[model samples]
Target chain A: SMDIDPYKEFGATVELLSFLPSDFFPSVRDLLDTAAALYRDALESPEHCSPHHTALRQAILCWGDLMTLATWVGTNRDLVVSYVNTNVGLKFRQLLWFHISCLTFGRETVLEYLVSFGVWIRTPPAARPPNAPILS
Target chain B: SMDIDPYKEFGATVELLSFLPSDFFPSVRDLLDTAAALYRDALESPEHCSPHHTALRQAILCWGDLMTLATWVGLVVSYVNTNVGLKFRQLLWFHISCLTFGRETVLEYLVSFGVWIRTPPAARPPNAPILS
Candidate 1:
């Protein structure tokens, strides 16, 4: 409808740019953060298990942070530049396109976000940091 | 009511010894796998991004996979075993508690697997893997 600026609102590294209706950007990031914590602590104590297992655990957390960044960049293309513009954003599109080309054997050919078959994910948070890191 | 074996179901890498309720075991793994794919592919192609950035991306994927394994183990615990017996599981619980600690200033808590406010999740999977 209309462009709104709340960049000052969030001490968060990334700032909102899209004037998309409903403002679900942070909500998406929060879900990713929740997913992040679920594994971060889960694996930390499982730390002493083995190096192979350690690597696997870290991989999971890494993705969670990556997703948080993805959603942020996806919405804030207005601020797109530098590292995120070339490093993260462009390739991110290519990847989504890659998956779309290969079907997942599901009912629909179209790819949509938040396609959960089970597990009820409640409403996400408004604003806050999840530790580990935040991206601009 | 009944029991199931995942070790064989997951095809031999690791065998599950516990007989957790509600055979949603594989379903949980599926979500994890799905989440895994999301970041793995997203980060790999972004490889040339930078060394530090590479590490950050890897950390995100690492956590994603770890979460998948946690759901599998939490349900398969057969009550409690190993360090996850309390520490890991309890640590996860502690983390959740922290997230829930603060509120109104921000809002409510969301532990659901896919919390999408704008996008409505696909029709509830007809199969209903989460049975009682």
Candidate 2:
């Protein structure tokens, strides 16, 4: 029996995103944009799954993915830039792909983000950052 | 002004860990051992920081640095090892470090994890797996 509902989970993430503090965003537009994306992702997800189920899964996966990236950078400056650079463009797609692929493969994946896991999935420094140095 | 008590947060994490189903681990000893490691990290940390503050800045960093080689290896396996291996370890570490480093650094230095600073710092993946 599945205890976690994916759709409701993702919907809540969207809801939580809506309530974030003002200074946290470059502009209200940016906050709305991020919320919209999360909302859209939840809405567009397969109908068979409840919004809560999708939301929960997506929120967990997204959070986990970010945690991995943060650890890779090691230091404060690196961590900030790493997250900023990763978020500005197609990064979400990769996370989406990871989630979908995992499902397709029938893997019993963990919904949480673990630091050690991030190190394992991370691309080598040479391949990841063009101007950045390798962080241990 | 500090709004939350760190000891209560650590206590909650311990409480949650205690409720996890037995099958999540290969053995009761291993499960208890891992749980203790989590508990130790939480208890050893300063109490002023919130949960995210504790998990990222203290527990995760401590584990990354102080956990024995075997413990580290076990962490990698216990948390992230999926059938396909999406390298959950990498993502896990990135977020934890991001959380530890703070939102400014997470946004400026590490952009990989989506940074919406206005949101309250929350821990991801709180629940354990249910046995099928």
Candidate 3:
């Protein structure tokens, strides 16, 4: 039915993160740099086979993986909260949305994945399910 | 805390469309061309004021208005069945799901509005106070 399995996807991302070095922060920094380059290439030419689209695809996959892991552990909760509290979070969040939005080819799928992970919110339910988990 | 009024938005679009010529198809074609120009401009500079961003924003708004009207009219049902019938309808339905998946921007808001207008499956509890 094309429905997403958020739990399984999150679990897979956590597994991938665990395989990295114990001191994982630097790797994430590197990953971001790699993503930035790929995004630039994608923007230059958005053809399916263009370097930009290819790189953008890879970057989107990386973001999904990272987001899933973050959702699981709430690892950067304080940092995120601090950023949002300072209004810097708003800018940061806008950039994040923009980056993801650039993938016109797969924007919808990526957004749905983000929504499934609670990274983005969908339209509010007319009425909440009786025992639905609260989204942070 | 933030909510969207799909009906209100859809109505506004309808009002705007009504003001156009009786033959509106050509106007839509022109709109698409305008969107393409704006998109190209945004791609060149990628800023808030960039032509691309401005065009993309305008395009998204148009899409929402069109989608809201389509949802209201059960257009998808007829379109799918007429163009593709039952067998192709299956594949078309899957593709439709993919097309509608983006939830980050106005698309999400439009999709939510569509969902809100549907009848819920669950039965209302007996003794629930009724107030219209």
Candidate 4:
């Protein structure tokens, strides 16, 4: 079994892109600032809205969106494919980068945030994802 | 459906973080550089190794990873959960943000890159996610 560590092989590249000045993507600076805030809100909020509840957390919402992607692919790929292809897909990509950026630049803040919510990467919660009320 | 253009609702936030200057997280800047390279590689290579292949492309590879996330949740949540929860889950999030940052700062490069691959957000590919 080849155990690929997704984090370690994080970088492999080719070719050169015109590195536009950060000013060009005004949204990105805003993205980091904004994602940080959302994460903080969830961290500070009560358990019902916190990562403890599991449904409304930032990354998990992204997870649900990932989960939802499969449904339309089976029967109604066009319904979402066209809709998501352009816009949401970009947003999806942005969210991932933001989290990674956090892991990179904000690892300690994430640690505090996780600690704030009593999240455990190594330990599963007393209540599982099945028992969580996310459908509504 | 309402028109919430996905690009604009991109950010809203609260609270402060202990801005651990880019030095600590050596991975992020590298992430941007690396992801940029992946996008570029797919751009220059032949269609088979390109996004034209659909299945093997970077974003699609990540998408398949995302799609794969569902199967384990249904029958064997525990099987994949324990394994993914710690590591790959962070990765899943990383790929998304990498793609997003590209859209933000690298929009022009992405436009050129997309033009190179001859991919369209509007047009579905003629081939499957299949090996062409």
Candidate 5:
């Protein structure tokens, strides 16, 4: 009786990670550090296992996935550039840069940066800069 | 004014050998040894960037990612099981154990052990009667 779960196979996970480019490591490290801190803190304090833990864990996992995807785009840049114009690539390029910037800078700066780039000029003037509005 | 071409960024790829788990150090040492041999052969000959170079680079990169993921899983297990359960924890427990032990011993033995567990019927036919 093969009771093993297919999703839990270590080799397959390794193969998937291997396909990603080396450029992803810095961001991967950041996410890992964040998740590790969250777990370590949670283990120390009993009250730490709330919805906050779940949200932070999901955020770190999403960050890892995004970094992996960015590395794929980076490695396959020629393919992306050929399909999309330099403009679209530029947007994606900036988008990834912005994501990395957010990872480094506080997350609050992401919306400000996006707004500064005129991404949400149509939304409302109140939603724009200087005030550094909280991101929903 | 900013250039958005990612291909140019590829040249600045980080040296990742430093970030892998210590458990992967032995395998990494082997890969590095193999890479050095390939480079030495290339330097002696005319072709420096052959298909062999590409293949070896890919193999090292893949191994690095695998080691990184393994480390991540190992860390997550202790955290998760601190708040969670049995079967999944058991799987994680042994997966990490095999990884760490194989780092010290032969990797082939780890695979063989897995196979032995999988095919106990063929390997043993019947369970040996326990004296206890």
Candidate 6:
């Protein structure tokens, strides 16, 4: 099975982001411009040695890590439940709000990028599930 | 609240598809082509519509219609439990399969198109939703 730790993937993406050109924005900017550049480069490159290729490889690794992490998290429902039970209801609600906010923002960022690229929401060519056939 | 009826939106998309160039295929091929062209035209227009918006709008409408028709056919579990079932499970499954298949194909088309556009996965524009 593929690696699925989203946190690890996030970490790796942050690391990759550190390698991007730094002049795009000041250090105070909120999002990781470096990682964004790598992701964009990966999508833009046509050559094996291109920066985009590096970015794509890194993204694929990160995706695999996230998938693996997700599977592991599925088995930790009891732990999550226990934590929620011991925590105050309002605390849990606040944590949930934070998690939801992060997830929504992250997804929106990805979607906006996809929209800019003119992508139409097709399955990844290299990563389609085994039982699934080519979409078209 | 939106002024549009669920049924009307579905009908409008179907009508738009009906007028699509006759070269459309029977399976995902037609959906992909239609999605691409629609994306292209939408972007080329002054509005600069994203491919996601073009493809997603159609998918939602089509899927919504399928759900509406499933209810109309008395295949819904809630509806079936309350009334005599029509035993249209087979047909219902087929319709659902087709709808989802079309949706995925459309989505895939968009993904490939996005690759072409050099969009940044992490860039948050002014219109980006505030994360709560």
Deviation in angstroms for A47 in model 4?
30
Please provide, for model 2 over B42-92, each residue's C-alpha lDDT reduced to its tens digit, 9 standing for 90 to 100.
424334233333233322322332223224223344333341123323223
* Candidate 5 clashing pairs, residues 3+ apart or interchain: none
Best-fitting candidate, measured by lDDT? Answer: 4
Clashes of 5: 0
Better of 1 and 2 by lDDT: 2
lDDT of candidate 3 over A1-136, digit per residue (tens): 0111111211222232223223312333343454455454533332434322332333333233334333432442465434222332222233333343334435345434443534212225654344532222
Per-residue C-alpha lDDT of model 5 across residues A1-136, encoded as one tens digit per residue:
0111111111122232223233423443443554464354442332323322322332333334334433444563464434332222322233233333444454456445544444333346776565533333
**Alpha-carbon error at A61 in model 4, in Å?**
7.3
TM-score of chain A of 2: 0.26
TM-score of chain A of 6: 0.24
Question: How do the residues A13-51 of candidate 1 rate in per-residue lDDT, one tens digit apiece?
Answer: 112122122222233234334334433343344223322
Model 2 earns a TM-score of 0.21
DockQ of each: 0.04, 0.02, 0.01, 0.04, 0.03, 0.01
Model 2 sits at a Cα RMSD from the real structure of 21.0
For candidate 3, give the DockQ. Answer: 0.01
Candidate 2: lDDT of A89?
A: 19
Give TM-score, chain B, model 1: 0.24
Query: lDDT (CA) for every model shown?
Result: 0.29, 0.32, 0.32, 0.34, 0.33, 0.30
Assess chain B of each prediction and give its TM-score.
0.24, 0.25, 0.27, 0.24, 0.28, 0.24
Off by over 4 Å in 3: A1-14, A25-29, A50-136, B1-132
Q: What is the lDDT of residue B48 in candidate 4?
A: 33
What does candidate 5's lDDT look like per residue over B5-112, in tens digits? 111111211122112222422333443453454344432332323322222322333333333433433333332223222212222222233333432242344444
The residue-by-residue lDDT of candidate 3 on B1-132, one tens digit each, is 111111121122223222322331233334444444433343233234422232233233323333333344343434422322322222222222222342133334433434443325474333422112
* Residue range with the least summed lDDT across 10 consecutive positions in model 2 chain A: A1-10
Pitting candidate 4 against candidate 5, the one with the higher lDDT is 4
